[PDB]
Design a protein around this ligand. Structure first.
Ligand SMILES: [Zn+2]
Lengths: 159, 204, 104
RNA sequence: CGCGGGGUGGAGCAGCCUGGUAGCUCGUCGGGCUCAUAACCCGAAGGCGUCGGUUCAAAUCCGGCCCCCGCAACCA
RNA sequence: CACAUGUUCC
RNA sequence: GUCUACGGCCAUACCACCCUGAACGCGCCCGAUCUCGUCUGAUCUCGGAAGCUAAGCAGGGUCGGGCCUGGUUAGUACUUGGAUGGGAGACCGCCUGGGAAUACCGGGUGCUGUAGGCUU
RNA sequence: UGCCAGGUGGGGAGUUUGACUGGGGCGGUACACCUGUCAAACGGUAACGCAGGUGUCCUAAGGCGAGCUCAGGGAGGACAGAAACCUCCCGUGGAGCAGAAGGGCAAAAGCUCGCUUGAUCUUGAUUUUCAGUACGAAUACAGACCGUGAAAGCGGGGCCUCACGAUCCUUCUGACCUUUUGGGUUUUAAGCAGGAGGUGUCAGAAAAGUUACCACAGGGAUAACUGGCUUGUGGCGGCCAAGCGUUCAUAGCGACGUCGCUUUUUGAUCCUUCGAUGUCGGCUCUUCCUAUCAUUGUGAAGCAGAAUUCACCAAGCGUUGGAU
RNA sequence: AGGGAACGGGCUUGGCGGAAUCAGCGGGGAAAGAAGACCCUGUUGAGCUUGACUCUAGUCUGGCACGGUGAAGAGACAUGA
RNA sequence: AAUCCGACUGUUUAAUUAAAACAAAGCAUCGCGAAGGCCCGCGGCGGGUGUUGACGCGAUGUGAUUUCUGCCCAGUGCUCUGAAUGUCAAAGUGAAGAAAUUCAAUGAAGCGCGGGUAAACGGCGGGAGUAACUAUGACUCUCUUAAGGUAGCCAAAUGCCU
RNA sequence: GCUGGUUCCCUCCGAAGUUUCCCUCAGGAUAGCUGGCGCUCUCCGCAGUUUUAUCCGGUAAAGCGAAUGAUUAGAGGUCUUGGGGCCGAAACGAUCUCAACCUAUUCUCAAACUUUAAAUGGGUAAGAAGCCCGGCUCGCUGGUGUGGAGCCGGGCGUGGAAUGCGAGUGCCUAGUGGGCCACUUUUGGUAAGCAGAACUGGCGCUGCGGGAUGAACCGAACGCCGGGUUAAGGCGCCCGAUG
């Protein structure tokens, strides 16, 4: 049986990438985080106080509390029977804006622009996203030359 | 006094090299990995006869020594004492284990017996280079070394010039046009990316 | 471990950081008239051998050292105990170790 | 846990109850004695477990600490 | 009160 | 075009050598009474402006190293799923989809925010 | 003599004599924890799996502020050389940060100074094992008193991952605290809150052996036979050929290597049986196998004869009397 | 013979099998006789031992009461030069 | 004709063990002079030894005859004396307090301390130097805990190697 | 807490040998699985699925001419030193070297190495609980009716990827807590019908056709029947079918 330590198997998890050691960049510290922001977790090995547990590494949560120099968020952790909406306190260097939501917000703004537009026209423009359709049958040409014949190679022992 | 090679033929466990943790290992039987006229240039031994494995197995150090002596013994007799240069391209680093009896398996972890060499399919075991008139002297001598190895091995004569990574049909013109410089057993590849004073060192 | 005989720390009654006198608290006498001692003396009276267990499986080789903070400022005289981690050596107010000195 | 006592040259015993010299043997370097050996007699080292104080002055009387054993004791 | 012994040939 | 002050990204920015710097600047530089600290005004602090691009710094260059980004390596190695596939086994082949990393060969050698100058 | 108090008291009485375990016992702790790996790129994940470590230590090795760069290497300089001291240059850290290991750190988190005790008091919330319960550890805060710095800030112990313990009982501390049962006062005692005195079998009984005089309830969940898988070991047979064989590898052999068979040895496992399968040998007797000792028929010999070796079809027939 | 729960009378594939019996016989029916006693578990006991944990009979010692009488001495305390 | 054991006659596990086992005469100890030694008994001015008195009673070890019974009291037992006195309960004494209560001195037996005892339980090794081949040690020194197996005997009923 | 037994039918639903704790290991408690009792809504909402964007890895692979550890072989070096000598009193003067060191190469690796680095996976978001406005409150923060949060009032329906399914929720509650096998990954062991792990599926709990026989193999899961057609297997006879 393995030990029950807090930082078990974090040899490569809470380690800085190659040629990225030293002083932590200042743009991560002074980012702003409001309530309800979608935030993912990536533990940074330089700072140690406020370090999240390894089970939340790579997961994403939602901000419910903002303190002076730490942000409390609600993550979704599954433990063997259900997902727990649990509340953790974590320092800023482990906090990054999640851009998964940003694609949806820029779509809503673009959809509402095209919802106000053509409202005086009435045209049903395709508003929902669609999957990849069939490839819309087309003519393919070759400029005079015939498609050159390809040939399987004879076997030769390279080694 | 040891077990036969049937017990350790297959690559059963993870690689277990001799390191800080794996200590107390008896020394490998193979010490010299190449002999012959090794102090030779690349212009006089352009054959590059290779021994190629065909299975995913383990080759013991005493098996490598067994095929080292018998291949070298006939090769000296065939062309001469210094008419060849042979190498073995398996260095035994994996360490096999023994559960020695006198209890059962109550806390039974192995003790090192010796070294062994992991081999893949198509990886060169033994390399021999000599002149062009000793082509049949190398092939049949390597057939004698097949009997000292477990499993199936195949004999291939490569198209490489000596123990280098270059093709033998086009090895000459780079030497004449000065893109390759021999240095004993190997050759020096000269790219057009270094300082121009290095180009002025040659071509003069 | 070494702790000084004087330490300026918080006081409950005054509410401000004041200097305090540091000493080690030692276990007092059982006083023979506590509720548990009177219960145990009545239970052990008469026949029946012994009623309550005797702990004879000691494993700790140390004790948690305890201080006794005495408030030196007059008319307060507030006493307090501060707990420090386990150690087998403990002395008061001596040998500040003189960093950068002869090793022999 | 509270009533005690004792730690001493390279090794074993005093001097402690009363403070004034750290001593006696045994191992070592030698010197004498007997014609010589042996035995015996002598000179020399090298040391009061530790801290502080009372005191003209401490190993000595004191208090606290490290190493031991005598006892009596035991509800986390 | 102790004192034991002085390698062989001449 | 360029510099100073404070920065953001943190090597396309670093490292080694060579060359050029008009103006403003940045610095080199001259001193130690006062503020200050040392064994020593070398460092730090203060008071200055006779000289200078010598250095720092800026720019450019090296069939330069390094770094960044591509081709090759290679649909190779590997791998989700499948078979009453092979093989004595070791292992391998096929269908289905995904898809690497060396060596080697190319291109590039900092952008940019605010305030304040010079080229009036 | 009666009653108390102390000592002795297996003469007698009651009870105990932990757990895991490739049977049990012995050995160890895999029983409470910590690191890397196994661990199959979220997490979790086992074996008496591997290398290990812990029950400490620190008045500073804690908390600020300030200044420097370390290990190592090169060049030099009286004694001074391989290492004593001083200077210059290179130096992404290859040293150091208390310990085992991992991660992290360069005008620091390292080295050296100045000052200090945030190692102080009190609510709550969350994480870590989790049942999402505790203990321990930690993370943001909030209310105060502070330390340091010029300030921003930093700090309510140790750069992070372990360094530790419930009920009851006892001790101490705190309030102009409550009760002390008819009223009042005091001593005492019982409470409330916090800390300590420990349960290492570490979510915590108070606990020595033997039984061949033994008994009971069970177990093939588990050994001591055989049988079953495998063949480490034993035995047996092959392939290559450095050499032995007066020269000649293969008449007979055959090292260094390598491939296989057997359950007539010991092993490994516990799959069958503990509502019982009588557990060694010897005697007697029946049958079977060939890996053939001899006899039948043969081939080859370092087969001149004789005698003796190697090989083949071949189990039909034999393989003894005795000392211990 | 095979597989099976790893040794079949039953199952499968084959060999095949013919009423009712008598006297022997010990190959088998993992024959019967007994909930294995050898091994282990039980928080099941019993006998015995002791440096196991609690006690205790007995025994030794001290005090109180039964316990009265007289005479010296002696120890401490005290008075105290 | 020999070996081992038990001296022997005797007894023993009725129902697997008839013996080398038990007992036995002999030998050597221990306690006790009677309000005592050993023991029984819930109890008593109780009872057995005892209708008895050291040539006796009670508890032991060994096992005829002959010969001998060596060393060791460090350990565990047993026993002896002892203000030379560390510890030591109840009761009593002194002091403080309003009292419960607290403290102090005193402080029996027994443990310690000091002797004795091994026909008490028991134990009886090394190392180092050392004799005219070597070897070995007649001799000398040290501990652990007190000496280090003496007289005798054997590959034994006692020896793994065997 | 250990064995043995535990009595009528039918219908419906239907498991587990696992987490943690216990002097716990033949057993209990607690979670998990199951059954029953129901309730709140429908005639938005939820998915052992996929797609679109967004992050996480350090495993397979590969590398060491990149760090750390291990390691083969030759080359060019100069005085960076030294052992053997040789011409030297001696001299970095000369001189053939031989040694370690340095520089470019080269062979082979690492579960407790890594610059790189997959496939399979793990979180999200894909609207009404969302946007866009106007205004009040704040004892918190505040050059600035600044920032943040909370309250109000109002407008946007064009239900903002695919696919399918009526969903949510509250009580009691038995039994279980000895598992085993198999494709793949993988630990110890030479190996094992050996012991121990991950995912998934089976036996346990399950009949049927086939593999002659049969736990786990292939197909396929079952109310009682007729016709037709097949899977896997098969079609000389046993034995249906190539007579
Ligand atoms: Zn105070």
């Amino acid at each position: 049986t393995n030990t029950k330590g807090k930082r078990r198997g974090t040899r490569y998890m809470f380690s800085r990438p190659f040629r990225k050691h030293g002083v932590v960049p200042l743009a991560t510290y002074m980012r702003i985080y409001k309530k309800g922001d979608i935030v993912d977790i990536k533990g940074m090995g330089t700072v140690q106080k406020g370090m999240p547990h390894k089970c939340y590494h790579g997961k994403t949560g939602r901000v419910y509390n903002v303190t002076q120099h730490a942000v409390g968020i609600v993550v979704n952790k599954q433990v063997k029977g259900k997902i727990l909406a649990k509340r953790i306190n974590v320092r800023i260097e482990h906090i990054k804006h999640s851009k998964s939501r940003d694609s949806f917000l820029k779509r809503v703004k673009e959809n509402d622009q095209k919802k106000k537009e053509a409202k005086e026209k009435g045209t049903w423009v395709q508003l929902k996203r669609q999957p990849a359709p069939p490839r819309e049958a087309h003519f393919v040409r070759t400029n005079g030359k015939e498609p050159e014949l390809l040939e399987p190679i004879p076997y030769e022992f390279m080694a | 006094g040891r077990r036969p090679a049937r017990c350790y033929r297959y690559c059963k466990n993870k690689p277990y090299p001799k390191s800080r943790f794996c200590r107390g290992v008896p020394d490998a039987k193979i010490r010299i990995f190449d002999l012959g006229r090794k102090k030779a240039k690349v212009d006089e031994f352009p054959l590059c006869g290779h021994m190629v494995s065909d299975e995913y197995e383990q080759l013991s150090s005493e098996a490598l020594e067994a095929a080292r002596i018998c291949a070298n013994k006939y090769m000296v007799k065939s062309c001469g004492k210094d008419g060849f240069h042979i190498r073995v391209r398996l260095h035994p680093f994996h360490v096999i284990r023994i559960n020695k009896m006198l209890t059962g398996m109550r806390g039974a972890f192995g003790k090192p017996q010796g070294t062994v060499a992991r081999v893949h399919i198509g990886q060169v075991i033994m390399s021999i280079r000599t002149k062009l008139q000793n082509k049949e002297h190398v092939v049949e001598a390597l057939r004698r070394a097949k009997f000292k190895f477990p499993g199936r091995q195949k004999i291939h004569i490569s198209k490489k010039w000596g123990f280098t990574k270059f093709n033998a049909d086009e090895f000459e013109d780079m030497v004449a046009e000065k893109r390759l410089i021999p240095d004993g057993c190997g050759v020096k590849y000269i790219p057009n990316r270094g300082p121009l004073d290095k180009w002025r060192a040659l071509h003069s | 471990v070494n702790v000084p005989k004087t330490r300026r720390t918080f006081c409950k009654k005054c509410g401000k950081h004041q200097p305090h006198k540091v000493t080690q608290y030692k276990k007092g006498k059982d006083s023979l008239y506590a509720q548990g001692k009177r219960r145990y003396d009545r239970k052990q009276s008469g026949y029946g051998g012994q009623t309550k267990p005797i702990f004879r499986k000691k494993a700790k080789t140390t004790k948690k050292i305890v201080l006794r903070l005495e408030c030196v400022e007059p008319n307060c005289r507030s006493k307090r105990m501060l707990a420090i981690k386990r150690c087998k050596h403990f002395e008061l107010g001596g040998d500040k170790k003189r960093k950068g000195q002869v090793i022999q």
